[PDB]
Design a protein around this ligand. Structure first.
Ligand SMILES: [Mg+2]
Lengths: 99, 17, 276
């Protein structure tokens, strides 16, 4: 009936300050399918973030990939914010270039 | 290449085609 | 299976704001190739892989016709199922349906499958023999009886054993550059001191295809099952996958630890060590 999303925030390629890349937020293992996912730059919602077409795993849990082009720097902070019926409050997972 | 609806099986009542 | 063609259907009711939404996605192995979204403006089956774009307008009109009929079916099934479970018209509910065919190394039929779920719970499934069904409950048993009387399994089996594998073989040949490829993982190890007592060793596998991979950590060659942080395999966004495994080790004991990577593109499993 209800399954909490797993969240991974990461880049397409290992980050290099000043080099263009892609920021990804992969949400999986959730049910029902309604979910709110935002990519954040310095705590602010990034506009025109794209997402994959809704699909699901063997156990029926859904997965989605949200992504946008970014250029990481030393001081800018990136994150992924997720809200789902299973969460009492939106969960923010910070982007760490080492994960 | 998709199956047709009759190849998958129609769970519910018949509807106009 | 060596190769597979799979379709994933999802229909979600939203009683407050209009008609249900239906999403269909098609995959060959780990590569998505087609999509349909009842909410989208095109109202057409759309390509999502370059090799499928080669298909002519007859293919696209045919897939559009079929997917629109499946969209209608699965959006209406929500109302049918709501009635089967005495549910109110107020709440949001989900229909999911997955099916497909696998081929062996010779590109000949290996298996077929078909499963249907309501609100994320198994409802009805075709058995592996493609001749019988498994019903989860009382309501599903009545669908099963209906499908048995109508010989649905005969038509489904003919699709899974015939049409499904013939079109899979077509796609594997037309999209050979994308589909028949093996991208061995690009591997590296990172070291991140936790403190003066310990450091995290993180074994990376990047840019690999297909998604299937095994990352394991060992200390003196002994699997570190309990102490490994292993992330779920994740999509990079460019048609490749990523995965990492990490262990926390005592500072100065790094040399006792090894990470092993097993992947289809690797002729032999690969040993990684921390190189200071
Ligand atoms: Mg149908």
């Amino acid at each position: 009936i209800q399954r909490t999303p797993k969240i991974q925030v990461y880049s397409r390629h290992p980050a290099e300050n000043g080099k263009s890349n892609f920021l990804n937020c992969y949400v999986s293992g959730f049910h029902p399918s309604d979910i709110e996912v935002d990519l954040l730059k310095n705590g602010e919602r990034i506009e025109k973030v794209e997402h994959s077409d809704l699909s699901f795993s063997k156990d029926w849990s859904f997965y989605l990939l949200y992504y946008t082009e970014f250029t990481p720097t030393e001081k800018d902070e990136y994150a992924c914010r997720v809200n789902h019926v299973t969460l009492s409050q939106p969960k923010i997972v910070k982007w760490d270039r080492d994960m | 290449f998709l199956p047709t609806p009759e190849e998958l099986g129609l769970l519910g009542p018949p509807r106009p085609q | 299976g060596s190769h597979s063609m799979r379709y994933f259907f999802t229909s979600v009711s939203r009683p407050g704001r209009g008609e249900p939404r239906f999403i269909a996605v098609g995959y060959v192995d780990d590569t998505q190739f087609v999509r349909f979204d009842s909410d989208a403006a095109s109202q057409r089956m759309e390509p999502r892989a370059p090799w499928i774009e080669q298909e002519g307008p007859e293919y696209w009109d045919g897939e559009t016709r079929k997917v629109k009929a499946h969209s209608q079916t699965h959006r209406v099934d929500l109302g049918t199922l709501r009635g089967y479970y005495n549910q109110s018209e107020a709440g949001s509910h989900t229909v999911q349906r997955m099916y497909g065919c696998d081929v062996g190394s010779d590109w000949r039929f290996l298996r077929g499958y078909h499963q249907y779920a309501y609100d994320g719970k198994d409802y009805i499934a075709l058995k592996e023999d493609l001749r019988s069904w498994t019903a989860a409950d009382m309501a599903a048993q009545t669908t099963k009886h209906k499908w048995e009387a109508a010989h649905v399994a005969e038509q489904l089996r003919a699709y899974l054993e015939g049409t499904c594998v013939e079109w899979l073989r077509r796609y594997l040949e037309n999209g050979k550059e994308t589909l028949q490829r093996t991208d061995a993982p690009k591997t590296h190890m990172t070291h991140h001191a936790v403190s003066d007592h310990e450091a995290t060793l993180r074994c990376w596998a990047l840019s690999f295809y297909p998604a299937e991979i095994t990352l394991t950590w060992q200390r003196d060659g002994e699997d570190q099952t309990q102490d490994t942080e292993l992330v779920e395999t994740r999509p990079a966004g460019d048609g490749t996958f990523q995965k990492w495994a990490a262990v926390v080790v005592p500072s100065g004991q790094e040399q006792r630890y090894t990470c092993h990577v097993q992947h289809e593109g690797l002729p032999k499993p690969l040993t990684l060590r921390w190189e200071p």
